[model samples]
Target: YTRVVWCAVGPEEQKKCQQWSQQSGQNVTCATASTTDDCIVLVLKGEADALNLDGGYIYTAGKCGLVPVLAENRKSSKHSSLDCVLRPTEGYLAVAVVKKANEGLTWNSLKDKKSCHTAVDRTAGWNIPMGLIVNQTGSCAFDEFFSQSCAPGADPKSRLCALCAGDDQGLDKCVPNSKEKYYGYTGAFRCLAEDVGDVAFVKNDTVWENTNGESTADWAKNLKREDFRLLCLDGTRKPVTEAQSCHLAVAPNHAVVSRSDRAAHVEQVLLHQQALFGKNGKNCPDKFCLFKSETKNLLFNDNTECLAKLGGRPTYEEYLGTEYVTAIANLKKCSLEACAF
Candidate 1:
């Protein structure tokens, strides 16, 4: 049996992965690890077969000689790049957004504004863009730059989590984890909408998605696409729909990585597992579907139709592409060093 290391922060993450493992029959068994970094260590030491990781942790995996075996083929209406059929290295864009009424805020003039993020150390919301900020300013005192911020998963006392509203019982306030009210793509945008933050760092599709109150959630109610705009590096803002040209950076999608030598074996199991849990699969139509109706990105991403082959790109550099790699690379030093997240 292939032992997969499920890297997650909580019991639910493992519970979600366990459903797929149990359904995979005796061919696959899942072992739990504390976090993505912990899973990386286990895989390197030959304790586990594979793990699905976010873009933030993929580079670390690659640097440690692991290879990205399969990538989630996530679906997006705004992003034509990802079809139901996904291939390796296929990904989407990261963007910054602000309300239309916030005229004084531009990407360049973001020095003293309150900021929101999907989560600390996340690719789109934190790493890719923060790299640019670190490269430009040379200091991690983002609290000084942004008057206050709501980067969930950041140290609560740090400036990063200054504006985080937490679960609002004042309990998990400013803390990371799902317990925080504003910890994901939807939550970060809500932070901006409610005036909790001036700018929201999130994916390109974030505004297009939660706007006009199309979402049933009370916070997203009355949200309008016309009420928000994208922040571009060129000092100009564009409507949320035009993200392809105005984005700060386009980040890579999350990946399921395995030890380079174990790629074939892990890939075999993943392909088998996806056949059952993947979108369009038999079980998905019935119950406990892995991708069809995900409310959160636990062991795998949301909207994933399947796991696609990497086309023998052979490494993260080839799969992630140079621009995307550079964006991530820019953050590597900071992430590995001064920041614990």
Candidate 2:
């Protein structure tokens, strides 16, 4: 049996995970923890078995002695070698999207416009996008470039949260949880769609899936592809589908991680669970599918097409890869004291 810790993942999210636990037949029973940091703490203390994390937090977990086991494989034209063992999944492209009618807005002239972001320290949302700004201006005051923004997980009073709109829950305005209206990639896209902000900093798929309702990704369903545009570094616009040619930075995919010693068993249970409820699982017809979760991603990244075997438990040096390590190191934010992120 495996005891999992659901962290930073909301209560509604925990319920879905619990459903998977029940179906596991005592195979995987997960508990709840506070945020990403707390969940890592729980795993280190022996209170939980596994968690799904973004690249930034994977480094955090590694520092605490946890190793990554399952890599969240995303579909990309570049990284498909068709291996039985999951090599590195392709990285996601980070982009800045703006409304089609914002003709006056461009990357160079975004001096005082409003902004929206997935979260403060996320790889795509904050690091890649803002790292560009820092390199251009030689300052960390990304808060200054935008007149106001809805950057969840930032200091509340900072300009980062000034333009934030509330989510359906209306609990936290600038909180870093899904409870907040403008929290994740979709939420940031929604911020631009609803006219709460002029530009949205998000990943490549933020538009296609949300607009088409694929994967039940229902954030900007009211939108059509032509309704939005991408902001390029040279102050240009491109179709949302053209991220490869014009975008902020490509980020590493997310992963499902656990303690190093527990990697073998954790992987066994995940394989078991996948056989029962994964998108292509035997019992998918029964309707408890992991990929089709109506409630956004709880224990895994919603964008994950499948779980790929990481070459091995994290090597620390190999986890974030060269590009990401360089970008983050260049910024060197306060949280980078140990580069804990």
Candidate 3:
């Protein structure tokens, strides 16, 4: 039901192979063929199925009707050749090309290989120790597909542990390091595996309320929440830094933390820019503001912390200027809407 083609050539015989494919009636597609080494190209037309060649010069069938035809030929070998498979829609077809008189053989003499087959089946393995616990009033629970909420406790039974690391063959079980460095211990362990962004812990309830305080009843002119903060950490919950709030936007799905002075005000401005410009400038028209002036405020507000962290303001700038520029550029490409999905 399908047609296949193959070609092999040495440094001196490459041109001839290419010319043959061009004229071979079967509409062959040509890619680069190795001159000094043996190479095979598998082309699949119908149903977009294919396969490739492997070691020992064996033509193995893959997912689709594909087979590797080229066998590696060392430089010491005298003769080099390639093979192909072709099937007709109706009648039988056979063809062969050889350079020398006793170089090639008949179609029946060709090696017959069966196609590979695979079955959809579930794999059975030992469950590893892992879990997630959440106290939020939101919906969180464990199901067959995904365990969500574990009981509020430190015991293993009260927790839901899903297998994260280990060998399926029962070779080794996960062991905690003596220094508590290997495994993670933190809130919402399930979120550890998931790709989440920065999280912050806002201290003031007024600030938190103001961040999302807006009525949605007036749909046409309703104000939207442009700023957000969360408390995030690595899977192990190793504290990377303090629970700091950042300017959150969804343009390439980025969170820009204002480590500078006057962070609250500066972050508000960044949030405003993110709302107007859609986090990233992708959809924004030309002549839009490219720089945020409140960045200076952020810098000033965090000057003391920066000096302490880096031993001086000038030294900090010298070390982090390029990094900060890259971070801003990345934030400019973030997609807040995309991140929600």
Candidate 4:
């Protein structure tokens, strides 16, 4: 009669997790935290059993001895006969975006530019983009590369937080939560849309979602997809539609992680729970859908198809790939506190 305790970051996710706990008939329980770091700490201390994380967060948690459990599988653009759970994970493209009007601002000319990031430790938003910059320049002074920028979770007084706009009330400046006006994917892109930053480090999906009437929000309603361009590694600028050939890196999907000792139980509990509440689950919609949320994203990504099982129980490094692990390792050498468990 083992029960899994899941850690939820933010109050919104806490409410969603509470609903899931109730729907699971107490097969699962919830622990809440203000940030993902706090949630990871709870799992490490045994106050919680597991939680899903972006790859950059995965690197942090993995270094602290957590293991990867199941990965988020998204709907494939092409037809695939394979079941969602058994299909191999194809990482998303991480990209550097700028307005089409910002001519001559290719990857080679990013130095001293104003920038926008999803957060301090996300995959596309931080690790992948910064990792490449550090590797290329043979310098660890990434903070100095951008003249001024909005990278949430950074020291509020630092240049990194200079461009950050707090919530409507404008009090929580540079805070990592959604309360910060420039915190996540949409927020960072909005920073660029409003002309606050010269470049935005986000993913390909972000550009598509907010442009050409895809998004109805006031700030995004008039955005044209062709008005943006992606900066390629070779120093060329390509239209937003060419992201497949112009990206920083292909990043791993967010995945659930747990301590090795609790991994089996966590996997078993999640599998059974999703069977009843997932996309096509018996009780979903009629009762509760674990993957659906009223807010932008809660607990799981809204685009998630299923929690797919890993083929060989890969170690965190194996799952993230050797090249990415080495890139993060190299960049981590520049900061002592960022690697702190």
Candidate 5:
């Protein structure tokens, strides 16, 4: 039984220390000192193991066995001496107990879980995009966008769409609309910005459809040419919004590009292209070939049968025969060697 006595320089300080002791289940005997010199006497006489002194009188009490607890050398304090004997070898247990006790007093089980999980999941998915490689544990340990100045947000749509949004591309603009909410498989629609410029849809490609067919039609009509806010299909769209920010309703048809599956496909495609064309790929194409090629095949491929094998037709196809085709067509028209220009 090593007895630990903690002292304060004045009545006010003593009261605070006593309250802390009571809350933490520590039994403290209160003693008062008019001056820091008197406080040091209490420590040297074994009446107090620790002294927390006020700022002004530190120098005068210097030689009375009172040592200044330097900010840089925290471990040199007398509290550390007492703590070494009183605290358990594994020190965190006491801290954990204090935290748990505090939590129990102020915690709501449902609210805590709901609030915590929302933040946890969003933080977990932060910066993770479709084709980036994560570890075997699916931990996004590496920073993919380190070279870029922007940080990733919790929203999946934002994370994926931000890259294009930062550029001047029209498809990257996703404005919000309150009426006629974007419906999904689960019927719950969260208002989010849509990627306006992704032209990856090929004819007969398997496009995710809404139940009434209105969702796809609206998506094509409203979202195709200009920036419009629309409801996204559930399960199909990733939950990108911060959980606390909105009420999420379950939707069955909602889908998103599966990270693991899509990543594998992207990896395979990159590997195939790399093998075919070598690392430099004829002086490295100026634009991102993946988006350009995917968009071209979707817009111009007249043969639906051949396109169906690549992936079936989009459920609600955008008729891109006009200026839209011409503008995007030039982006994809170049050969590998011609890509350098």
Candidate 6:
């Protein structure tokens, strides 16, 4: 008789969750929050049951005792015989992207450039890029590395938040949510696309998904794939298609999380629900595509193929992998507040 209460991080997500709730026949419900951390708080307090999260946020929630339930499985880059649900997760490539016309810009020339990020606590956007920067510079003063940036979740008055454009009314300028115009994968990429920032920290899939007319969104509709380049750590740049050889890091996939006590329930509900509304679900298109959205990514990443099961119910550290967890740990030392939350 228990219905899972999924925590949505924004108004659009809440609306989508509501539709999902109705479609779920009340087997699932919705709880709304303005940010990922707030949603994590709701789950911690038992006001919510679950929500999917980026690996960085998963680290945050995991530290607070939430358990990862399922992982987002996308189209594999290599051939595999296992079913999507049974396949081991293949992490996505994080890349530093810039305009091809910015001829002199390379990974080594990044300092003092204006930048864009999905948000503070995201895998590709924040943790991986910033961690590498911190490691290379042997300095913790990364906020000053960029001349200006649209890093959502930074203090609005700081240079880090200078490039951020809030909602239509311009209210929540640097808040780490969809309300910020330059937030999340699409927003960060748009920040670079619109010339608001010199570089963007996002994944390789984001570059492909939003370029060459792949995304019909107004800001990205006409973006040519050939107009962008990926920055390699070796101080070279390459076409987007060569991301396999010139990328930043391989980031863990986003996944759903809930309190340990509610993990089993949330997992069962999601597995059944995705079976009904997932990528190849019976009621999709004619009913509702749980992964599609009116705009870009909403409740779940638009590219998600399925909420695949995790083998052996790995712990957060196990799922995130030891190297990644250690990287996040090293980065957190530079900014203790990232872990305090």
List clashing residue pairs in candidate 4: none
Report lDDT per candidate: 0.73, 0.74, 0.21, 0.89, 0.24, 0.90
The better candidate by TM-score, 1 or 6, is 6
In model 6, residue pairs whose N, Cα or C atoms come closer than 3 Å (at least 3 residues apart or on different chains), thus clashing, are none
TM-score of each: 0.84, 0.90, 0.14, 0.93, 0.19, 0.97
lDDT of 5 by residue, 1-341 (tens): 22234555434446544653553345334555643355556655656554432121222233232433211011222344443212212100000000111122211111111110101011111111111123222443323322221121223253322322221344212211101121111111111223221111100111212212423444333322112111121212211122222112111111111112122332333233322222233322532121112211111111111100112211111111133223223322321221111
Model 5 segments more than 4 A misplaced: 1-3, 54-56, 69-341
Is candidate 2 or 4 superior in TM-score?
4
lDDT of 2 by residue, 115-194 (tens): 89888778877888888888888877777888999998887878889877656756567877677778787678878888
Give residue 125's lDDT in candidate 3 (0 to 100).
8
Residue lDDT tens for model 4, 142-161: 88999999999899999999
The sequence of per-residue lDDT tens digits that candidate 1 reaches over residues 265-295 is: 8887677666776776767777657763234
Q: Which scores greater on lDDT, model 1 or model 6?
A: 6
The weakest ten consecutive residues by lDDT in model 1 span 332-341
Candidate achieving the largest lDDT: 6
Question: Which residue runs does candidate 4 get wrong by more than 4 Å?
Answer: 77-79, 336-339
Candidate 2 residue spans exceeding 4 A from truth: 1-8, 76-88, 167-169, 212-219, 312-314, 334-341
User: How high is the lDDT of residue 283 in model 2?
Assistant: 80
Output the number of the TM-score-best candidate: 6
lDDT of 3 by residue, 217-307 (tens): 2221222222222222222211112223211111110012222232234334333432333223442344232221121111011111111
- TM-score computed on alpha carbons, candidate 2: 0.90
lDDT of candidate model 1 versus the reference:
0.73
Candidate 2 clashing pairs, residues 3+ apart or interchain? none
Clashes of each: 4, 0, 27, 0, 26, 0
Can you rank all candidates by lDDT, best first? 6, 4, 2, 1, 5, 3
For model 6, residues 1-341, the per-residue Cα lDDT tens digits are 36899999878788888999998898889999999999999999999999999999999998888899999989885747778887878878999999999999999999999999999979999999999999899999999999999999999999999999999999999998888899899999999999999999999889888887888888888999999999999999999999989988998899999998888888887878878999989899889889998446898889888988998879988999899999988998877433345
> Candidate 6's C-alpha lDDT?
0.90
